[PDB]
Structure formats: structure tokens, C-alpha cells
């Protein structure tokens, strides 16, 4: 599958509401209207934008929206890794607002699909005409998707493209050369692990379109307009199986038929995530399934954690290549300093040290013997991005203890 897929949740202030006189049905068939013409804008890119959930905060807003767009991003990324993500799966989110955002009409940071607090962007209610809104909206998302405003030698065709640092009173749906590159760059080197996945058709909160090259209820298939389909089990213009067609979709479909019984369509991470196979009668591939968490694995060197098998040892080797290992156990009580890179966790943006017993769970350290020197406790460490270096969650600190929120806890009680 060629194409990634942007779980979208859109968020709508109490300005907009007031603004439409509290027309909540006007508001989300506004919404569906515009992430309709994002997911046509995306074709290009190879990605698709999908809505999965729309909150209205037309009680009152749980941010203080203020023209300051600086203020107002940070705050609703804060909101939504916080809150919203808390209780809905979903990749990316955006904010409407009716409040005039001072120097800008949106914002948005820049390459970070998938960040739990940076995934975000704000749209200002600039103007009533649905691809005004869905080109702002497209042009945040471009940004979370890694890319920056157009310059010099970048083109879309004598057209507006959509990453100029102004919008055009003649906004066209196209992204330029250098948008398109420099999109699928960012997917790349970095990984937006979580636009992987096909958001199902009930994760789809829009009224179904058949067309759209999104399976939503309703649908056998879809492979978008009868002229871009190239789906041989599919007819476009309906959405319905058509020939020798038993399925159109799904990785148990190999050219329109179910695959044989038994045939693997999600392979094991590790003895700890358990591999899914197709059932023969059915195109869709069960739902991944992960061993319960806190279950012995790697003889007996770790436990289960999310389908892996999280130790210090793969963890120094990942970090440090070669020749190094789990340092000796006062290398980690180094943690309890809580200085720049020595601790056990963060709350409210504070580093917390580690107290004596949870010391096997902040910074990792590990003992180098790679050629070349000697090193007792090694420890990674870069502002770039501070948790890289520290143990990972689940991982086993102690003979029947693992780690949870930085705390070295029995396996028994942890999950
Ligand atoms: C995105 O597409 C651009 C082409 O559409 C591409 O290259 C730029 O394209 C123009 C013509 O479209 C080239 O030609 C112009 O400049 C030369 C040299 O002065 C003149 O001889 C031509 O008559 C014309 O005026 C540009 O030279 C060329 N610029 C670059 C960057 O090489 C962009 O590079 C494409 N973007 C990317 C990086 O993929
Ligand atoms: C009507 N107002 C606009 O078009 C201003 C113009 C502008 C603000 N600061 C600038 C710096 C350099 C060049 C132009 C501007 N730009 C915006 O609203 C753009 C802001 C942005 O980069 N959002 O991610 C989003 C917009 C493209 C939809
Ligand atoms: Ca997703
Ligand atoms: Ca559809
Ligand atoms: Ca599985
Ligand atoms: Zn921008």
C-alpha cells in the first residue's frame, strides 16, 4: 500500500459556534465538506485525510484561545496530547477558530505527524468559502508532514500553489514539486509510524462518499473516480464488487479473491506480539494481537511489552552498536541526581531523579568495550530529544521487576 493515511480530529471553538448562531449541524456539515477537498488536495502526496472525530466546544473552550497564534498552538498541543489523545486514537488534530489570530490565519509546527503534543495546527474562520478554509487546513497539515513554504525555483503550475507563505485570493488545490519531495522526505528519514495504518470504515465519522478512495460503510470497494481506477474488482461509479470478484480490499484480497486459510498476513515482531492470519472466507486481516504484557520472554531476560520484548541489552546495542552491555549497577545510580540527563521522569516540564529503587529505569547507562577505549557508563544523551537514551517502558530492571512510568515495579502488579 502506496498510500499513508492521516487520522484526523478537528476541533471547533466557541467563537465559530457563536458565529453560526450555534447551527451545530451547519458547523459539521461545514467540517465534512472541508476534509473532503483536503483528502482530493493529498492525492497528489500519495496520502489520504480521513475525519475520525469532531469536537465542538460550544459549552466553552478548554483552552484559552487567544489571538496570540504562538500561544494559542502550543496550548491546544498541550490540550490534545493531554486530553483528547488520552481518550482518542487518532494522528493528527487542528483547531478552528472564529478569533482573528493576530499576524497569521493558521500555524502549525513542522514535521511532526504523529507527535502526541506537536501533531497540531490552528485555522483561523478566514473566509466562508469551503476551499478557502480546506487550502489553510491542507497547508497546516503540509507542515505537520514536514514541509516548508515554497521559494524561488518551486512550482505547481501557473497556479497558487498551496505552501506560499501567503494564501492567494486564487487559491488553487495544488501542492508544488518542491512540497511533494520534501513531504515524502520527511516520511523517510523520520517515521510517521502512526499514518501507516487504514483508519476502518466505522473509524470514519463523515458521511460515506463513494469516490473518495476511502472504504467507508456501505462499500464493498472504492477506488476513487471511474477514471483513476485502476482496481480491477471494483466499479467505481458504485462502490460494488463486480466479475470474478470475491473481495476488493484488504490484505487476505490477492487479485480479487480471499487468500487460502491459514495465510499469514501480519508477521510476529517478536514471541511476544503473536502473527494473524486470514480465515479464507474473509478479505480483512483480523485485528493485530499482542501477547498479555508482564509475560516472560527472551528466556527469561525480559517481559512482554506491546508484542515486544523490550531489554537493556538490545537497548545499549541500538544505542551504541557493538562490544557494549548493561552497566554495573552504580553506573545507574547516576540517576538520582535529576541534573540534565541523570533521572527517572518529567512533570511539568521538571526533571525528576530517580529514587534509590527505581534508579534501573530513568537514563540508561551501559559499560563500552568497543574497540578503541574503555567506558563503565555510557549513557546517550541529546537535547535534540532527551527521552532518547532513557530505558523503555516494560523493560525487565530487576529479577521479576519491570519498568512502568519510570518506577522499577513487580511484573505481577504492573499490568
Ligand atoms: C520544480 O520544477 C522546476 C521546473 O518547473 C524545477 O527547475 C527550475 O525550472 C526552470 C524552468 O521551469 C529552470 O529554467 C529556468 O532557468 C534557466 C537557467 O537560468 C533558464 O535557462 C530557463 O530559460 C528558465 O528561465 C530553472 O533553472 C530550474 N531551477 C532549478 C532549481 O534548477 C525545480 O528545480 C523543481 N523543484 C525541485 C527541486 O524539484
Ligand atoms: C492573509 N494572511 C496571510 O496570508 C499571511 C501572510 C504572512 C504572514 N506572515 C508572513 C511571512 C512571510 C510571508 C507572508 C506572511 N500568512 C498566513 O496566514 C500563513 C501562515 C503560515 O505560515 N501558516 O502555517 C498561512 C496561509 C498561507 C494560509
Ligand atoms: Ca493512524
Ligand atoms: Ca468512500
Ligand atoms: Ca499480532
Ligand atoms: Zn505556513
Known amino acids: 500500500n502506496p498510500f499513508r493515511f492521516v487520522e484526523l480530529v478537528l476541533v471547533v471553538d466557541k467563537a465559530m459556534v457563536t458565529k453560526n448562531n450555534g447551527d451545530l449541524d451547519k458547523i459539521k456539515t461545514r467540517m465534512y465538506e472541508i476534509v473532503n477537498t483536503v483528502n482530493e488536495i493529498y492525492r497528489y502526496m500519495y496520502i489520504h485525510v480521513a475525519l475520525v472525530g469532531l469536537e465542538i466546544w460550544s459549552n466553552e473552550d478548554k483552552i484559552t484561545v487567544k489571538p496570540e497564534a504562538g500561544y494559542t498552538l ?3 498541543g498541550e490540550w490534545r496530547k493531554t486530553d483528547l489523545l488520552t481518550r482518542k486514537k487518532h494522528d493528527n488534530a487542528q483547531l478552528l477558530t472564529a478569533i482573528d489570530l493576530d499576524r497569521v490565519i493558521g500555524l502549525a509546527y513542522v514535521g511532526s505527524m504523529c507527535h502526541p503534543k506537536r501533531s497540531t495546527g490552528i485555522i483561523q474562520d478566514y473566509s466562508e468559502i469551503n476551499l478557502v478554509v480546506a487550502v489553510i487546513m491542507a497547508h497546516e497539515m503540509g507542515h505537520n508532514l514536514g514541509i516548508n513554504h515554497d521559494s524561488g525555483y518551486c512550482s505547481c503550475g501557473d497556479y497558487a500553489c498551496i505552501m506560499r507563505p501567503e494564501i492567494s485570493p486564487e487559491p488553487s488545490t495544488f501542492f508544488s514539486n518542491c512540497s511533494y519531495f520534501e513531504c515524502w522526505d520527511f516520511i523517510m528519514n523520520h517515521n510517521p509510524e502512526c499514518i501507516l495504518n487504514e483508519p ?9 462518499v463513494c469516490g473518495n478512495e476511502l472504504l467507508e460503510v456501505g462499500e464493498e470497494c472504492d477506488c476513487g473516480t471511474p477514471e483513476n481506477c485502476q482496481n480491477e474488482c471494483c466499479d467505481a461509479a458504485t462502490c460494488k464488487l463486480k466479475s470474478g470478484s470475491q473481495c476488493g480490499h484488504g490484505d487476505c484480497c490477492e487479485q480479487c479473491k480471499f487468500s487460502k486459510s491459514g495465510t499469514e498476513c501480519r508477521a510476529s515482531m517478536s514471541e511476544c506480539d503473536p502473527a494473524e492470519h486470514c480465515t479464507g472466507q474473509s478479505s480483512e486481516c483480523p485485528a493485530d494481537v499482542f501477547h498479555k504484557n508482564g509475560q516472560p520472554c527472551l528466556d527469561n531476560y525480559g517481559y512482554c511489552y506491546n508484542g515486544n520484548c523490550p531489554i537493556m541489552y538490545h537497548q545499549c546495542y ?47 547507562y551501559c559499560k563500552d568495550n568497543s574497540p578503541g577505549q574503555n567506558n563503565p557508563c555510557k549513557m546517550f544523551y541529546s537535547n535534540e530529544d532527551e527521552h532518547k537514551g532513557m530505558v523503555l517502558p516494560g523493560t525487565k530492571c530487576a529479577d521479576g521487576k519491570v519498568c512502568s512510568n519510570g518506577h522499577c515495579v513487580d511484573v505481577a502488579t504492573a499490568y
Open 318 to 364: 541500538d544505542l551504541f552498536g557493538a562490544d557494549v552491555y548493561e552497566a554495573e549497577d552504580s553506573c545507574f545510580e547516576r540517576n538520582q541526581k535529576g541534573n540534565y540527563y541523570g533521572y527517572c521522569r518529567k512533570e511539568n516540564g521538571n526533571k525528576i531523579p530517580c529514587a534509590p529503587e527505581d534508579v534501573k529505569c530513568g537514563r540508561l
Open 74 to 76: 502550543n496550548a491546544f
Open 200 to 208: 476502518l470504515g466505522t473509524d470514519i465519522i463523515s458521511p460515506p
